[PDB]
């Protein structure tokens, strides 16, 4: 037996890390200095495709641990994007009847495909800005205590999850660890497995990849002004790149064809801050050894045409699109 | 971990169906009938074909017909096309696939994103004028070489070297294997390895009924015969009409969570048959299925959703 499991949910983390030799600034070091590496984490290699398998599956548990769910619950969750699936899948295998509430914009192909996973979708309508999902969902589970709501937004097993996985996985991978690159979202991911590297590695440094194109996991509700995401620890980042949306599609154009790596619309910006960070290490003349996270593949992306014709094309394309 | 995507092929995820499966736990009404599926979809590209096209470049090499300049030539729109693309890449090669002026708009990009260059064949003389068009194309200069997936062994040795013998390592109690009949090289290539070193090991088809095409699957009475396909090979085949196909996908989905493509569909239905028929024996089953891709690419054209006579 080597990858032998009883459940698909055994057979999440654990993912490749792989080393892009022709995208990186310097894979050898030689005579202009140190080598400038780009390593790939490819969290795409899970039961839906994306890296909310790990909290989705960790926020249940520790749900369980806690006492809150019990045989016969249903989970209600206010949600969108990437979530919405490995909830939906992570439930299920758990034996929990799922909701999920959702904003009225929601496509009627991904209502469809949530549902044959089991969920049923309630639609909050929102007279307002992008939704009302959070405080619906709220009301509905106050209806019944038997119904939890699991929040993924404060939710601290969404950053244990990287905390206890993707953290401790990069770090085995990549003892020579220099940066950390990751989108922002809830800020699972970079609080998480941030904490995590910053407890082992002297000064990694932990970026912040900010997509400024498409709608993320906040679309759906109704923030206020500057938000501060609750997970969020202030101490953590070292630094944040704000990218749009031509950088980041030939950057995901150009990972297929240089590495053959057909990722997500949100690891456009994570590369394109990633290269940043490594034109850096030597303008510099510093060595690097970046690890960046590829949250999802390209597949449910490319229907937008965000992968075909003009940059033009793509950017528009990329419009009221979840990159999340 | 990995200084390339091709080292992170193959040692796919062999996942109990306990929800799906005709009998998961042993009980006093009978032994279990257990269904285990392989995860091909958690390749490279996303398909089991990274596995044969790395293996087949990897041949052409050996045998010195590709050198640093060369450009492959493979009649396809499919599955292999993209994986063709990946290695070709990253092994320094240019790929030209050859597929007719019929196939769709989506795949186009698809291949071309992953660095291929399209050669239309003429439209309504289907896969077939399309391989006889590469053929010829590969025939104008010695730097252009066609690999041939229908009849290339090392399609099939693919299998017997990486899929079999996963297989036997994580399932040694396997009693039967089944999968999709397209190339034949995953039946063959694993079913020679796992009747070599399984005694009483049941080798199965899945394949579409005739005119009723399941994507990615042939019939080989309505198609050409690969010269890959040995008949001694299976001890069963079973024909699966689309509907049926289509409602195994969504209740793999339902029931255990896995998003596969519809080839997978059909190989349940081999593989729930099967089951069923040792379920009603008596006999303890452990029964090794192909999800051969993910169901991404299939979501478009509404056969997740919606009636089951409208699944086109």
């Known amino acids: 037996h080597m990858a032998r499991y009883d459940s698909l949910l055994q057979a999440l983390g654990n993912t490749p890390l792989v080393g892009l030799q022709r995208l990186s600034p310097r894979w050898d070091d030689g005579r202009d200095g140190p080598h400038v590496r780009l390593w790939a984490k490819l969290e795409d290699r899970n039961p839906t495709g994306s890296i909310k398998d790990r909290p989705a599956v960790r926020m249940i548990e520790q749900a369980e641990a806690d006492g809150l769910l019990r045989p016969g619950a249903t989970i209600l969750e206010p949600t969108s994007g990437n979530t919405g699936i490995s909830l939906a899948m992570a439930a299920r295998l758990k034996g929990y009847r799922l909701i999920c509430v959702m904003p009225e914009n929601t496509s009627v192909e991904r209502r469809q495909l949530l549902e044959l996973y089991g969920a049923q979708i309630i639609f909050s309508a929102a007279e307002g800005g992008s939704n009302t999902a959070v405080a619906t969902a709220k009301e509905l589970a106050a209806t019944n205590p038997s119904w939890v709501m699991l929040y993924q937004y404060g939710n601290p097993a969404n950053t244990d999850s990287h905390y206890c996985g993707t953290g401790p996985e ?21 609080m998480g497995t941030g904490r995590f590297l910053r407890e ?10 900010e997509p400024r194109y498409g709608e993320g996991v906040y679309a759906l509700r109704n923030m206020d002004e500057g938000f501060v995401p609750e997970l969020y620890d202030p101490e953590i980042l070292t630094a944040r790149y704000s990218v749009g949306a031509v950088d980041a599609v030939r950057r995901t154009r150009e990972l297929v064809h240089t590495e053959g790596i057909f990722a997500g619309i949100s690891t456009g910006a994570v590369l394109h801050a990633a290269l940043g960070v490594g034109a850096g290490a030597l303008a510099a003349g510093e060595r690097a050894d970046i690890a960046l996270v590829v949250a999802d593949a390209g597949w449910k ?17 990329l419009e009221g699109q979840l990159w999340a």
């Open 301 to 317: 992306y490319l229907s937008t045409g965000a992968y075909a014709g003009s940059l033009d094309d793509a950017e528009t394309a």
């Open 200 to 209: 082992h590695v002297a000064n990694v440094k932990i970026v912040a990849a």
């Open 170 to 190: 990069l770090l085995a991978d990549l003892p020579e660890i220099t940066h950390f690159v990751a989108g922002l979202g809830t800020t699972g991911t970079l």
